[PDB]
Amino acid sequence: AVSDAIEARLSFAFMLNSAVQRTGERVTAEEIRYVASELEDTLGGVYSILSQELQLPLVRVLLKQLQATQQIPELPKEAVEPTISTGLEAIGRGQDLDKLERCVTAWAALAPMRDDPDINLAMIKLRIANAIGIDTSGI
Amino acid sequence: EKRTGLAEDGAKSVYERLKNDRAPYETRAQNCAQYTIPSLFPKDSDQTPWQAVGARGLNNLASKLMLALFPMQTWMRLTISEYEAKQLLSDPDGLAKVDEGLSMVERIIMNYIESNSYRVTLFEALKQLVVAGNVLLYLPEPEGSNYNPMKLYRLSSYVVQRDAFGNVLQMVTRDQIAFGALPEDIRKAVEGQGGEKKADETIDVYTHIYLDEDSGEYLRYEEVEGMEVQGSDGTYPKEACPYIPIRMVRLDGESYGRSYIEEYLGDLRSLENLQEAIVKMSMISSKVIGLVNPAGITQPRRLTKAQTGDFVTGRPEDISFLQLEKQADFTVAKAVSDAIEARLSFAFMLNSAVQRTGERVTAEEIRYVASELEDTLGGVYSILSQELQLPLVRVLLKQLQATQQIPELPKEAVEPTISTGLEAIGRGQDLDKLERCVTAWAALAPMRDDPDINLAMIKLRIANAIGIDTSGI
Amino acid sequence: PKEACPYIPIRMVRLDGESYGRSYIEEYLGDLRSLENLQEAIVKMSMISSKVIGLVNPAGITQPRRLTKAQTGDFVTGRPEDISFLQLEKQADFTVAK
Amino acid sequence: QTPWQAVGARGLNNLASKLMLALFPMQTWMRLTISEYEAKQLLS
Amino acid sequence: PKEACPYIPIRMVRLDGESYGRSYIEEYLGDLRSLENLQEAIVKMSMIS
Amino acid sequence: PEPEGSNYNPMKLYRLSSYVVQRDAFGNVLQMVTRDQIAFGALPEDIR
């Protein structure tokens, strides 16, 4: 019993998906999702640390190493010292994409008044995008 | 020049005097770390723990806070200053310009934070911020566009003093650089003051900062062996000091802060003290020891040699195995251990405190007891937003305008307001009140074709009580 | 001015006719001490339960030295009647207090 | 000499595996974007 | 050049004011030894059984 | 190492025991001394 009590505690600290595996009770579905979002919470911890400690320095060195051996076909001055994004940004499923179709879905909220009696949909469709935080340049 | 005022008697002399009202606060931090991760605050002056509970709790607490305060997302939102926003009324072409560039500084601050590896030290800061009362952050001048990291001083190797209103009066750090690493200016000055030094001798390097009674600003200087350092003098303005000392739990009328783990320390020690005896008990239980009666026929030699399947000269009355049979008292101790370990799991925002092996846990209690972890976390978050998030942004803004990495903008955006929290994620109360008001205009769709109802005045009062701007609706 | 003093003294529980206020935890203090006084004896009890202590009968053949030295799997000169472990067996009274 | 348990073994291995597939996938996991100072230059 | 050295030394757990970093497993080492020290006696017991 | 053309330029990894580091106050790298343990029959002819 003591060994299994410890082995469970460790299984959490090694992001083992089989720490939910408690042979004690009829494990529900609503705790599985919640105790799994504690494994994601402590993993997002080490990931956002190693992004700074090992991911970005590795890219930053390869960038300057490959521009120096001219395998990088030259580009207009604006892109020789850029900004290096990583994480959910680079997978393509980042906060930017979130805020846009979180704003598209707020313009379907004023569909039961697209035919607006003096409501003025023009300023609202702009303030909605203001609070969210898009660019609004040319919308 | 001999300096007086606060640094009248040197630097190291102030460090050792203020080390006396700080000594209780590091002893407290020492105890809390001994039961979590000792490496964060070793018990060296004024070995691992038997349990990993506090260990996984401390790490999970910091992780949840670091991912809350400092995400990959933009987590600050600059917006036009009120006094200079009333000036630009009804001018949306020259007003969108001021907010757009404000949202450019929104990004510049991030890129500086990303590429300079601020996050990785902020984590080690939050870990320290929780088990120890305080941390000291130093972010030097940008100095070009290089790799300008952040420096972190743990409580034991720095010292602070505050006034009545809680403002910083003086701060004396204390690096412990090895001689073979000091700058050549300081290095030759050291062995040239008496005694040549080896390459591994450790040199105490202090760093006084203090307000000047005459000026309205801070004066600093490095200091080695009792004599001031070459080229180390300098001044910082009072409103933008790049040395930030952060407290966790305030106690208005005190130089330092209280730690977070401190408040639940009594139970945390009860668990470690128990887990020790429990594990030690488990080792005794799994220890197999025979007991051959010497007045008997069975000889101990023949048994240890015997293979499986062997028959052996002896009777079963002579041998017996050492039974511990403390099964009863173990269940008592293990039940208390689990009861305490659970109480702490709530105080460490462990999502696995719902994990009660007692009953068929429903779906409707999980949501409610999870909204107590959200309720006690929003506590420390909205505190650290003021104690560590807002001061950090406020310093980098004035630090980056001073090295003109901020492309200039129209006067309205030189002193704006710095919003944080759910505002900057973009899912704040503003967006809430807007589509909570749109959804009140779809409620009068079964009378859009209104017989004399007048939808114009109603569609306006709805937005009034809610609290939108109503400017041009 | 009387209408805008920047020193504010706040009470929790008013008692009109008194300078200070009553605390909120005060009203439930009696149970709060009952719990602490109990948890003390409870926690202390678990420590005695998990304390393993042998009891070698000196008039017996089994000597305490040989046992502490022995490895796991070793057989040892002795009888099981000589050794016993200090049982607390307050399982009944524990469940009451808990 | 080897350990009596494979707990840390599979734990350590699972820790590395999850991190490498998070940090370094077959996917493109960095995103370069225009520097801010030289992006305001190329406006409109 | 200082800005692009191709030798990169990485730390795991920072402790600002030290050349090297702390390991991740170090923080939970006590329980990891409790388990192994136990698993030995358990496995050894099963062989005796 | 440097790309050195477009060849097979792998990555070298030094474990903690066969390398050593020193840093300053702000945490920047001061010096690094590695330590391979190559067998004589493998060294380049210059060093050999």
Numbering used by the authors:
A (entry chain D): 343 to 481
B (entry chain C): 3 to 48, 55 to 481
C (entry chain B): 245 to 342
D (entry chain D): 55 to 98
E (entry chain D): 245 to 293
F (entry chain D): 148 to 195
Sentences from the paper on this structure:
Nevertheless, self-rotation function (SRF) calculations performed with MOLREP indicated that the T7 portal was composed of 13 protomers in the data set 1 crystal. Comparing the peaks at χ = 30°, χ = 27.7° and χ = 25.7°, which would correspond to the presence of dodecameric, tridecameric or tetradecameric NCS, respectively, the highest peak was found to be in the χ = 27.7° section. Therefore, the complex present in the crystal was a tri­decamer, with one ring per asymmetric unit and with a solvent content of 49%. Eventually, the 3D classification of a subset of 1200 particles with RELION yielded a map of a tridecameric portal at 7.8 Å resolution. Built as polyalanine chains, the model consisted of nine α-helices. It contained 194 residues of the total of 536 amino acids present in the gp8 monomer. The resulting tridecameric partial model was used for MR with Phaser against data set 1. The model was then subjected to rigid-body refinement by protomer using REFMAC5, which moved all of the protomers significantly (3.5 Å) towards the central channel, shrinking the particle diameter and central channel. Solvent flattening, histogram matching and NCS averaging were applied with masks generated from the cryo-EM map. The correlation between NCS-related regions of the map was 0.849. This DM procedure yielded a fully interpretable electron-density map of the particle.
